[PDB]
């Protein structure tokens, strides 16, 4: 805003027109402070991503500095809001925020990932100039991965009448849904109503359930409560029951959403209108056969995902986040674990609308700091909250851990995508001292979660289960006794079996799996020189497993509910095997600064293993993908100059061919068929059982041929169980690879060629480097320069390469393995964006993006 | 890429080239590494793919030129061995240098005339050969968009050592007018060369037969007496064919003949050479004008620049042929190739289509124009170097004579070509005295009369109307030599004085009108105010200060038997010269993006006609009827004068028009008005119509059409046409919009391909017009929706266009805004037969899909 007045929506965007300064000496909380030389910024904003890399920082957190940042916004509150209540909401600030309003200190908030709020009412100047100030102190080292710094999530203002529904004030339960499904469904609601006026109110609620977007004419249930007197200055929980007439279920394939609207009446008139989003669905976890959704067995085909958005840094841009989910859905992913901290609300929103199941994790460490990170949340978890700290969002009577956990649950309690609360990750890993206190701390978190929300199972991800620690056994039983689910980090097949034998009562899953480490487009070796790693699936960390192995072990076992592979997307920091937990660079500078863990790189460009997962997980598409790229200077030659050719596919049978350079005739190289296996619960998977099968069982989840090198084309044909061809139009992946010429042309394409002109929406522009005939040159690293004209601007450039230290805010970047990305953002005026990609000696490429005015 | 006998005597050499843009590289060596260079098929324009820049000139569309290198490596078989080889260029713009296998063959300045190089002397038989062309379009070189590079076809000629010379056959029929119907005498002259090491005893067997074309249907043959021609020498062999009753080449029946020359040495045939011909004669009388084959004909002509719109300067045969087809439908029967030799392809189409061509060779002479220090003005008078082995025309004087005779040599037998034009406004936009021009003029005239005697020479002079002494002197020299004087931009009053003070001259409007209009713009009826949307009215009330509106320039010509005809500037819009936002130096005009193609065109660059097209159709095409109404009838596009009355204009050739109105929501039409034309007849017997009612316009020429002032209201304005006997003229025999209706909002695209089956040769095109219409199919008059094209199958997208001048969007993109409801995609076939699928899409609108068949070469 620049001015706040009636009638903005009850909750309105407050992202625009802030001023920013990086200084650990300035004191700028006074409204009369001169900030004329400060940067003007729109939020969300990350001030680590704009600073330089430095060897004096830590590899763990991408060698980037944190620091003390100040944010100021001056805005008018019109006289017409005089008797209204005003609050400011932060979906996240990393970290150690301090908030002032018109010179008065309101309070503080340590945790960089939980949402919080401040009432502004008591200090507001109605009919005047106002100044809100936020001091942020990301004092390093505070993180095991790249955190970023600043107000990296959206900010809103909430304006209401004196009588109003409390912050996150509606809870909905449907405890008999499974039985009532298709008929009248009982909704039990509880609504906190606050009377912040100087007279008693006679309150009735009018609550309505209707399809999202969506008018009240199409409601499927309503209720009006009996009159309840709420005294001046008091609040009350108001229980109500809605009978919902045959609601449509929220499922992965059809994620139906409803709006649940609460109108607060006092006397005869409506004073407040509160909406919350809801979906009808139920889940189950069973010790013997795993997970179910709405009464149907479902395998949790999941990824772990850190919060950052690549070249954008920590900024929680809704489209950036929506794009990640889309790319993951294409892989066959149906679930995300928010490692290791609450997600942005934007992710929750996207998963509600797209039909993705979320395991929302709240904490990494508990009351013991990890990896030498003396300023991490470990230092805060068990501290108390000062009585004059006015911060709002959760329970304030015990510790920060209770506040941040209940604050997170309060925000997302009605979101259908969220299926479990995860309370910790590897709590006893990388810390110092006794772990004798960890069972009691766990039981305490479990009790708080149960009392906050009875509708979902709680969990955690624990890596000492495989080591059989007593503390872990005790903690596991405690989860179970409270209807929770036990997540084991990095167990193999044999350990899954041991847990199941040793603990028959536990419902279990793979809460962190694989940790395969690969670069994109790397073929001149097949096993784990140039600060890159093979793209073949034969490279994992010592405690981890390659992708085929971690899946093979899960797919055979109905009692292992699912897997959350580490990770879906590469993220900034933890550049294992070049990681470092203290100060200083690893290997020669520039050192790898982002992860190798991801199936998809930071730019959103899939690595080869993407198509293995797709062949395993996506039953809505077929897959046929060949590696390696077929250029002499990128392949690996084994015995007899034979190259390992790998095919990932969900087909029943594959024929492999070769075409010589300059020929139009292909000859047959090989032919292989899979075997269908079926588990007791009815899950099916495919394995190769021919007599030339690999000696390692899991590698038979895919196909390998040893092919002599020669210039030309390797191509594949796919057949179903009835020996009918599976045509190219129905199949994803590279069904052929060919020897390319030298780089000659750029080829750009935008993912969405029409976007919203709201100063927020993004268009992602992939640029390929190709030869004269359009084949992507596999090792091309040509420097590409973007020229953006019209109603938008370049906000990022990326190539996903870990050792690339070039600025993400530059207008140019080297391609890596033939690809480079540019990200363009709209303005607040409708128009058109023209983007030209250029490289020396190559043909240029132009895309055209239209931007449309907000309805 | 290899040349094997018996591939045709002349074969298409367009495929498999390599190109790089660089003024630094030196790539004339066969060893030079091509591997990173772009791969291109000719013809090719490398200006059109570059970006617009305010650093360039408005005149030439704000596009750059630069240095382009072309490389082709190929193998010469032993299947040949000992034969003569030559490479032929129809055009390279400009300043070309040629190496072969490393040896510099020579250079050629002019970007518009054809040329050749013998490759025999430096060839590698049985081995590998590398031809290299360097192109240097140093800007500023042109008053309009030229393009750069090898923008016309390239061929190889492979012959025996004893062979007909290049363009080696000249045909004359001096007594055709008398002999017509009977035996017609053909006087031939053939250059025969003996590039062997021994003498040869030669006879010629020449045969004339109908095009396509067996010799069993010949109408004349001759065998010459044995001539001895020595080794290393050539001899002009005259001969005579007696043609038995040849069918004439005329506009309605353009009969074409193949004249085949066999060269015999001893018993056998050593070389066989063909040239296209047509039997026809013309006259220019100072009193009654022009005639073809004894019959008076009025030259209804347009000026046409070389480029093909979104394709740039590329002389694609189908793009060329489509232009002519569109002009023919307008009733045009003659084209002036302004201001430079045409592509041979354009001479081929007119030969076949029955269009009269005036082939102009030069713009400026030996004085450069418009600050264009690198135009042909600096080369015109230069001499040709002794070691410059470039072939085509005479080399003993200047480039002026070389390019002039090279053009005459290529097309001396073309039946379509009626005149040679030797310049255009030679004294305009130059510095210094003009004292020297009457001499330069007389020299060019002498060069032409000596080169080809069968055609009159001419030029286009804009200083006659200003009565310059030098123009009088030059016109007299024209006349003395059997010439015809073309005057640029004379009106009725000035045509008459010319006729009075110079009674011996035969004259015509060499350049006329220069009306300036956008396609589909109606919210103002004049260019009387200064525009603000970078467009101009579609009403014919807009022309440059030296020019005239279309009805006025035609009114003046039709009334005067002594003005043989007109060549309207222009038939089609072209890139560059974007008057009245033109600029002759560097920098942009008005706010950027600045207008970058012309407004002069009757038809826009995409081939969509402007409204005035149907005015000309009503004046010119006697094979169709015309009934056309403007404006479009939406409230936000019309212009309201007094009383909220909109000027409605009807262009028609009918005798009588009834004008109606139908209120929105009704099916009942009411009569608004009714008007009838009067027929007029000149001394020579030409007829035209003018309105002489009591409510006629006070300006006479505006009465060649009909106007009504009509109050605005939602609904449909429609028209009925009647002949002189009061019998209705049905819609099925009439062209134009005979109704206009208030549309709804844009709802759907309607796509259509002009040809639904094209040739799979990698050259042929299908033109896909897309209209933005409402739910009921009416074109929304101001629709500017961005349309995106998905091309799949045996073809590819090569251009997109909307004809809008200030639109700078790349012509190579797969999308473009429509302009005034219309947009077009050009698609090209591949060399494999198949099916092309093209889907047009736009946000919020229904899509439209067409399928194009492509069929193999037989
Ligand atoms: Mg992202
Ligand atoms: Mg599948
Ligand atoms: Mg100039
Ligand atoms: Mg007619
Ligand atoms: Na992998
Ligand atoms: Ni550390």
For A730-748, give the DSSP string. GEES-SEEE---S--EEEE
DSSP class of A491: -
CB contacts, 8 Å: B813 with chain A: 846, 848
C-beta atoms surrounding B253 within 10 Å: 9
- Fold classification of B1-160 (topology level): Jelly Rolls (2.60.120)
Region label for A790, one of left (φ > 0), alpha (ψ between -120 and 50) or beta (otherwise): left
Q: Are strands B625-630 and B687-690 parallel, antiparallel or unpaired?
A: unpaired
* Ligand 3 center to B142 CA (angstroms): 7
What is the location of CATH 2.60.120.260 in chain B? 1-160
Counting ligands in written order, the one closest to the CA of A598 is: 5
3-state secondary structure A414-438: CCCCEEEEEEEECCCCCCCCCCCCH
Structure tokens at B199: 């003498």
Whether domain B161-281 has CATH 2.60.40.10: the reply is yes
Asked if residues A359 and A302 have their Cβ atoms less than 8 Å apart, the reply is yes
If DSSP codes are grouped into helix, strand and coil, which group holds residue B362?
Answer: coil
Describe the crossing of helices A400-412 and A438-452 by its angle, rounded to 10 degrees: 30
CB contacts, 8 Å: A785 with chain B: none
Helix (H) or strand (E) run with residue B656 in it: strand B656-663
C-beta atoms surrounding B387 within 10 Å: 8
Is position B59 annotated in a ligand binding site?
yes
* Ligand 3 center to A846 CA (angstroms): 29
Interface of B with A (CB under 8 A): 35-39, 51, 786, 788, 809-810, 813, 815, 843
Describe the crossing of helices A493-502 and A547-555 by its angle, rounded to 10 degrees: 30
Query: B609 pairs with which residues across the strands?
Result: B603
Asked if residues B118 and B195 have their Cβ atoms less than 8 Å apart, the reply is no
Q: Return d(Cα B459, Cα B441) in angstroms, integer.
A: 10
Q: Does the distance separating the beta carbons of A846 and B813 come in below 8 Å?
A: yes
Residue B507 makes CB contacts below 8 A (sequence gap 6+) with B286, B484, B485, B486, B487, B495, B498, B499, B562, B563, B564
Which residue of chain A comes nearest to B46, CA vs CA? A843
Asked if residues B131 and B26 have their Cβ atoms less than 8 Å apart, the reply is no
Which residue of chain B comes nearest to A845, CA vs CA? B813
Q: Return d(Cα B143, Cα B370) in angstroms, integer.
A: 7
Which residue of chain B comes nearest to A745, CA vs CA? B38
* Ligand 6 center to B288 CA (angstroms): 101
Q: Does the distance separating the beta carbons of A850 and B786 come in below 8 Å?
A: yes
CB contacts, 8 Å: B786 with chain A: 832, 848, 850
Q: Return d(Cα B188, Cα B238) in angstroms, integer.
A: 6
Is position A717 annotated in a ligand binding site?
no
CA distances to B679, B708, B721, B729, B730 from B724, rounded to whole Å, are 10, 21, 10, 10, 14
Q: Does the distance separating the beta carbons of B35 and A742 come in below 8 Å?
A: yes
If DSSP codes are grouped into helix, strand and coil, which group holds residue A562?
Answer: strand
Q: Return d(Cα A794, Cα A554) in angstroms, integer.
A: 43
Asked if residues B227 and B236 have their Cβ atoms less than 8 Å apart, the reply is no
Structure tokens at A313: 């840094």
- What is the resolution of the experimental data for this entry, in Å? 2.0
Asked if residues B15 and B168 have their Cβ atoms less than 8 Å apart, the reply is no
Whether domain B282-626 has CATH 3.60.70.12: the reply is no
C-beta atoms surrounding A669 within 10 Å: 16
CA distances to B53, B182, B224, B250 from B179, rounded to whole Å, are 60, 5, 23, 16
Is position B491 annotated in a ligand binding site?
no
Q: Return d(Cα A335, Cα A357) in angstroms, integer.
A: 4
A834: distance to nearest CA of chain B, Å? 9
Determine if the peptide bond prior to B655 is cis (ω within 30°). no
Q: Does the distance separating the beta carbons of A850 and B813 come in below 8 Å?
A: no
Residue with tokens 């045996």: B794
Query: A747 pairs with which residues across the strands?
Result: A768
CB contacts, 8 Å: A747 with chain B: none
Q: Does the distance separating the beta carbons of B809 and A772 come in below 8 Å?
A: no
Active site members of B: 425, 511
Which residue of chain B comes nearest to A748, CA vs CA? B813
* Ligand 6 center to A315 CA (angstroms): 22
B38: distance to nearest CA of chain A, Å? 6
CA distances to A326, A627, A774, B18, B447 from A767, rounded to whole Å, are 19, 21, 12, 24, 57
Is position B34 annotated in a ligand binding site?
no
Helical residues (DSSP H) of B354-491, grouped into ranges: 399-411, 437-451, 469-480
Q: Return d(Cα A570, Cα A306) in angstroms, integer.
A: 8
Q: Return d(Cα B146, Cα B60) in angstroms, integer.
A: 7
CB contacts, 8 Å: B38 with chain A: 744-745, 772, 843
Counting ligands in written order, the one closest to the CA of B140 is: 3
Please state how this structure was obtained.
X-ray
* Ligand 1 center to A341 CA (angstroms): 17
* Ligand 3 center to B360 CA (angstroms): 21
**CA dihedral angle for residue A103, residue A104, residue A106, residue A108, rounded to 10 degrees:** 60
Is position A138 annotated in a ligand binding site?
no
Per CATH, the architecture of B747-858 is what? Sandwich (2.60)
Determine if the peptide bond prior to A757 is cis (ω within 30°). no
Counting ligands in written order, the one closest to the CA of A541 is: 5
Asked if residues A610 and A500 have their Cβ atoms less than 8 Å apart, the reply is no
Residue A287 makes CB contacts below 8 A (sequence gap 6+) with A500, A504, A505, A506, A507, A508, A559
- Fold classification of A1-161 (topology level): Jelly Rolls (2.60.120)
Asked if residues B451 and B408 have their Cβ atoms less than 8 Å apart, the reply is yes
Query: A676 pairs with which residues across the strands?
Result: A686
**Residues in the 5 Å CB sphere of ion ligand 1:** A 309-310, 320
Asked if residues A319 and A795 have their Cβ atoms less than 8 Å apart, the reply is no
Region label for B811, one of left (φ > 0), alpha (ψ between -120 and 50) or beta (otherwise): alpha
Residue B58 makes CB contacts below 8 A (sequence gap 6+) with B576, B578, B581, B582, B583, B584, B588, B589, B594, B595, B596
Closest CA to A411 of A599, A167, A129, A155: A167
Is position B359 annotated in a ligand binding site?
no
Compute chain A's Rg from CA coordinates. Answer: 28
Asked if residues B689 and B679 have their Cβ atoms less than 8 Å apart, the reply is yes
CB contacts, 8 Å: A850 with chain B: 786, 843
DSSP class of B732: G
CATH of A283-623, one of 3.30.230.10, 2.60.120.280, 2.60.120.260, 3.20.20.80: 3.20.20.80
Q: Does the distance separating the beta carbons of B37 and A846 come in below 8 Å?
A: no
3-state secondary structure A304-336: ECCCCCHHHCCCCCHHHHHHHHHHHHHCCCCEE
Q: Does the distance separating the beta carbons of A741 and B35 come in below 8 Å?
A: yes
Counting ligands in written order, the one closest to the CA of A599 is: 5
Interface of A with B (CB under 8 A): 741-745, 753-754, 772-773, 832, 836, 841, 843, 846, 848, 850, 852
Structure tokens at B809: 């969007």
Q: Return d(Cα A399, Cα A448) in angstroms, integer.
A: 11
Residue with tokens 């709420």: A230
CB contacts, 8 Å: A744 with chain B: 36-39
Residue with tokens 């300036």: B516
CB contacts, 8 Å: B815 with chain A: 848
Q: Return d(Cα A210, Cα A241) in angstroms, integer.
A: 15
A728: distance to nearest CA of chain B, Å? 15
C-beta atoms surrounding B119 within 10 Å: 22
Counting ligands in written order, the one closest to the CA of A565 is: 5
Q: Return d(Cα B711, Cα B717) in angstroms, integer.
A: 11
Which residue of chain A comes nearest to B33, CA vs CA? A742
Q: Does the distance separating the beta carbons of A753 and B38 come in below 8 Å?
A: no
* Ligand 1 center to B231 CA (angstroms): 79
**Rounded to the nearest 5°, which phi and psi values hold at B693?**
-60, 170
What is the location of CATH 2.60.40.10 in chain A? 162-282, 744-855
Q: Are strands B115-118 and B84-89 parallel, antiparallel or unpaired?
A: antiparallel
Residue A533 makes CB contacts below 8 A (sequence gap 6+) with A517, A518, A519, A522, A539, A577, A596
Residue tagged active-site, from A322, A360, A361, A426: A426
- Fold classification of A162-282 (topology level): Immunoglobulin-like (2.60.40)
Closest CA to A464 of A444, A500, A488: A488
Q: Which of A848, A849, A850 to mutate to test the interface with B (most CBs of B within 10 A)?
A: A848
Burial class of A173 by CB neighbour count within 10 A (0 to 12, 13 to 18, 19+): middle
Residue with tokens 């001023």: A19
DSSP class of B607: S
Which residue of chain B comes nearest to A834, CA vs CA? B809
N- to C-terminal Cα separation, chain B: 21
Structure tokens at B749: 């695209």
Q: Return d(Cα A625, Cα B802) in angstroms, integer.
A: 41
For the domain spanning A744-855, the CATH number is 2.60.40.10
- Between chain A and chain B, the number of residue pairs with CB atoms below 8 A apart is 27
What is the location of CATH 2.60.40.10 in chain B? 161-281, 747-858
Residue A313 makes CB contacts below 8 A (sequence gap 6+) with A46, A48, A49, A146, A148, A152, A572, A808
**Rounded to the nearest 5°, which phi and psi values hold at A350?**
-65, -40
* Ligand 2 center to A564 CA (angstroms): 20
Is position A275 annotated in a ligand binding site?
no
Which residue of chain A comes nearest to B844, CA vs CA? A754
Q: Return d(Cα B596, Cα B666) in angstroms, integer.
A: 44
Is position B197 annotated in a ligand binding site?
no
B25: distance to nearest CA of chain A, Å? 12
* Ligand 5 center to A331 CA (angstroms): 14
């Amino acid at each position: 805003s620049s001015a706040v007045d009636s009638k903005q929506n009850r909750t309105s965007d407050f992202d625009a027109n802030w001023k920013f300064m990086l200084s650990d000496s300035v004191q700028a909380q006074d409204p009369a402070f001169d900030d004329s030389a400060w940067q003007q910024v729109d939020l969300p904003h990350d001030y680590s991503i704009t600073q330089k890399y430095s060897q004096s920082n830590e590899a763990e957190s991408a060698y980037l500095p944190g620091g003390t940042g100040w944010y100021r916004k001056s805005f008018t509150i019109d006289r017409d809001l005089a008797g209204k209540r005003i609050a400011i909401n932060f979906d996240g600030v990393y970290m150690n925020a301090t908030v002032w309003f018109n010179g008065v200190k309101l309070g503080t908030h340590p945790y960089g990932y939980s949402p919080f709020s401040f009432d502004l009412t008591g200090n507001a100047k109605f009919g005047g100039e106002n100044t809100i100030v936020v001091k942020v102190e990301n004092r390093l080292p505070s993180s095991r991965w790249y955190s970023g710094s600043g107000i990296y999530r959206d900010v809103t203002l909430t304006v209401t009448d004196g009588v109003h529904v409390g912050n996150n004030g509606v809870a909905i339960k449907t405890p008999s849904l499974a039985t009532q499904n298709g008929g009248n469904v009982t909704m039990n609601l509880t609504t906190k109503v606050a009377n912040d006026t100087e007279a008693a109110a006679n309150i009735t609620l009018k609550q309505t359930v209707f399809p999202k977007g969506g008018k009240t004419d199409a409601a499927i249930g309503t209720v009006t409560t009996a009159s309840k007197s709420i005294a001046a200055g008091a609040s009350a929980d108001v229980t109500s029951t809605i009978t919902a007439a045959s609601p449509k279920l929220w499922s992965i394939k059809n994620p139906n959403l409803y709006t649940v609207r609460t109108e607060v009446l006092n006397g005869d008139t409506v004073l407040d209108t509160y909406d919350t989003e809801y979906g009808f669905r139920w889940t189950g976890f069973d010790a013997t056969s795993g997970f179910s959704l709405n009464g149907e067995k479902v395998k949790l085909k999941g990824v772990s995902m850190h919060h950052d958005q690549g070249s954008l840094g920590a900024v929680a841009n809704r489209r950036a986040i929506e794009r990640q989910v889309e790319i993951l859905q294409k892989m066959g992913v149906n679930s995300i674990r928010t490692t290791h901290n609450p997600a942005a609300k934007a992710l929750i929103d996207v998963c509600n609308e797209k039909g993705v199941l979320v395991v929302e994790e709240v904490f990494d460490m508990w009351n013991r700091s990890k990896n030498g990170n003396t300023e991490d949340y470990g230092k805060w978890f068990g501290q108390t909250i000062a009585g004059d700290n006015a911060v709002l969002g959760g329970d304030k009577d015990e510790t920060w851990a209770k506040f941040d956990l209940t604050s997170t649950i309060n925000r997302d309690r009605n979101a259908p995508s969220v299926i479990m609360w995860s309370l910790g990750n590897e709590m006893m890993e990388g810390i110092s001292g006794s772990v004798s206190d960890f069972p009691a701390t766990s039981a305490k978190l479990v009790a708080w979660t149960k009392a906050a929300d009875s509708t979902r199972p709680m969990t955690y991800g624990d890596n000492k289960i495989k080591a059989n620690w007593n503390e872990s056994n005790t903690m596991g039983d405690n989860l179970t006794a409270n209807g929770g689910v036990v997540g084991t980090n990095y167990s193999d097949g044999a350990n899954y079996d041991k847990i199941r034998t040793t603990h028959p009562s536990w419902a279990i899953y793979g809460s962190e799996t694989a940790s395969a480490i690969n670069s994109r487009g790397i073929y001149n070796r097949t096993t784990g020189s140039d600060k890159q790693l093979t793209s073949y699936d034969n490279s994992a960390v010592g405690w981890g497993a390659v992708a085929s192995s971690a899946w093979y072990d899960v797919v055979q076992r109905d009692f292992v509910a699912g897997t959350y592979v580490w990770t879906g997307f590469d993220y900034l920091g933890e550049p294992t095997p070049w990681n470092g937990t203290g100060s200083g660079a690893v290997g020669s500078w520039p050192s790898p600064k982002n992860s190798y863990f991801g199936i998809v790189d930071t730019a959103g460009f899939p690595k080869d293993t993407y198509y293995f997962y797709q062949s395993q997980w996506n039953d809505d598409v077929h897959t046929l993908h060949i590696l390696p790229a077929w250029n002499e200077n990128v392949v690996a030659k084994g015995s007899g100059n034979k190259v390992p050719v790998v095919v990932y596919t969900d087909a029943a049978k594959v024929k492999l061919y070769f075409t010589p350079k300059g020929s139009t005739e292909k000859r047959l190289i090989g032919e292989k068929s899979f075997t269908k296996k079926t588990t007791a619960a009815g899950y099916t998977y495919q394995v190769y059982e021919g007599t030339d099968k690999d000696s390692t069982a899991h590698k038979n989840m895919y196909l390998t041929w040893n092919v002599p090198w020669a210039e030309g084309t390797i191509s594949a044909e796919a057949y179903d169980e009835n020996n009918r061809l599976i045509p190219e139009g129905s199949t994803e992946g590279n069904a052929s690879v060919t020897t390319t010429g030298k780089a000659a042309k750029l080829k750009a394409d935008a993912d969405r060629k029409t976007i919203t002109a709201d100063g927020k929406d993004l268009s992602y522009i992939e640029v390929d480097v190709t030869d004269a005939n359009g084949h992507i040159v596999p090792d091309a690293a040509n420097r590409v320069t973007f020229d953006v004209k019209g109603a938008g601007k370049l906000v990022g450039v990326d190539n996903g390469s870990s050792p690339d230290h070039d600025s993400y805010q530059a207008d140019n970047r080297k391609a890596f393995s033939g690809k480079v990305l540019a990200i363009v953002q709209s303005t607040k005026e409708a128009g058109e964006i023209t983007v030209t990609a250029k490289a020396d000696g190559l043909q240029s490429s132009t895309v055209k993006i239209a931007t449309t005015a907000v309805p």
